[model samples]
Target: GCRTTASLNITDGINVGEILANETSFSKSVVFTGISCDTSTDKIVYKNIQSDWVEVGPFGNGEKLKVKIESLGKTSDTIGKSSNAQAVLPYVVKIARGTPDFTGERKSTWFISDTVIANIGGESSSSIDFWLGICKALKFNWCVNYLTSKLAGDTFTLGLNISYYPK
Candidate 1:
């Protein structure tokens, strides 16, 4: 039997156009300049793209790992200044697990959550404790991706927790 945990904090500065373009080269520990609006369309749309994978473990063949969204929200000072106070932002959170090199019998699988809403203050509509699991491996890594509609000038953060144990 085994039980261990790990945590991650993603605060990179991301903008609407970059997100739309599916840019995945941003530094992991940069300040968030916040999401911007597309003046041409007066909207902010984000396409789904898996973030760079973060290696989690090298458990033995018979062990498995489970990941969960422990918490998701904006930093206290971050806010969606471009939207109305009561306006809602709809977004989807997808969690994926894959092998270290992504070329193995253990392929990647995505666990997606239902659309979640956020307000101008960057507060989530409800608890985001979704879980994705059963990654067995010689070694495994994981990523988080997003899909959004009408989210402008907002900066947010995500907290992920991983649990490892025997299969």
Candidate 2:
């Protein structure tokens, strides 16, 4: 059995005004900022801005894997003096098992609309149970992509936490 955790940090953040001005959806790989894994039981085989792949295996019958979103937050830095400079960020988290490219059949997806306030910040601390499966697989990966086509607000930073373990 193995347990691991990863963090995705968007240091540069995103500009809501710029996204709205373009009138188009913006999607890019934020990349994993940090990761902690059990070296004796698992290892990270591949990682990039778009996805991260962890290899953990040698399972018995009926073994399953569990994945979760530990926490997430958006730190807002509004340049204006108005208190109404808040906005909601609509984003998506995608998980894929058995493949790093996320082209496999076993997949899980979640849609999140996080509201961020100006100078006050926004937080979502609830544990999100993303995926669970009994299929024997050696690789697991996850990605966080955002859609700002419908968003209207100031700029803010995005942060995400994800964890996985054998069950």
Candidate 3:
């Protein structure tokens, strides 16, 4: 037997795609506003909103879809610090395809960060919840959903940002 294995040179399919000059992953953010999470008044509901339908791909063309919380903000200046905003309330984030509700294979978690007293908001929102690193299926649109358990306080104009790994 030969000391090292050897084989005739061969070429695989030439159909391999390439990243073009200045090729960069696609990125976008989805925002939701006028969103309210109220606990004292006992309002618990699943509020759903559709994102501007993005043509991710017929499966994102083998590129994985990426989602991250960019920010979670509120209208009241009484939020962030000097207030028990996040501590008194909890909210959830969920993403969907073709639908806003938790129908199909949507990803969600309690994405509100508690590092601050106001807004519980930030760049990427910095969630302690699990990451939604899953890609979408082929030929479908995407949307966003929010649900909150009975909150202790009420806040308005809460903002959320979801970044996509554009192909």
Clash totals for all models, in order?
A: 0, 0, 12
Q: Residue-wise lDDT of candidate 3 within 56-141, one digit each (tens)?
A: 11132333222222223332222212212222222223232321232233332112121112222221222212111121222223
Error in Å for residue 82 of model 1? 15
Residue 167 lDDT (model 3):
40
* Residue pair clashes in candidate 2: none
| Candidate 1 lDDT by residue in tens digits, 115-167 | 12222222233211111112112122432222122222242333333332323
Best by TM-score: 1
Which pairs clash (backbone N, Cα, C closer than 3 Å) in model 1?
none
Choose 1 or 3, whichever is better by lDDT: 1
Off by over 4 Å in 1: 1-60, 71-75, 78-150, 157-167
Worst 10 residues of 2 by lDDT: 126-135
RMSD of each: 16.3, 19.2, 21.9
In model 2, how large is the Cα lDDT of residue 79? 22
Q: Name the runs in model 3 displaced over 4 angstroms.
A: 1-58, 70-76, 79-147, 155-167
Better-scoring candidate (lDDT), 2 or 3? 2
Question: By TM-score, is 1 or 3 better?
Answer: 1
1-167, model 2: which lDDT tens digit per residue?
Answer: 11113222243232222111212222323332223322332221111112222322212212212222222233222223332222333333332332233333332222122211111111111111111111113222322222121112211324332223323
TM-score of each model, paired residue for residue: 0.23, 0.22, 0.21
Q: What local lDDT score does residue 24 receive in model 2, on the 0 to 100 scale?
A: 26
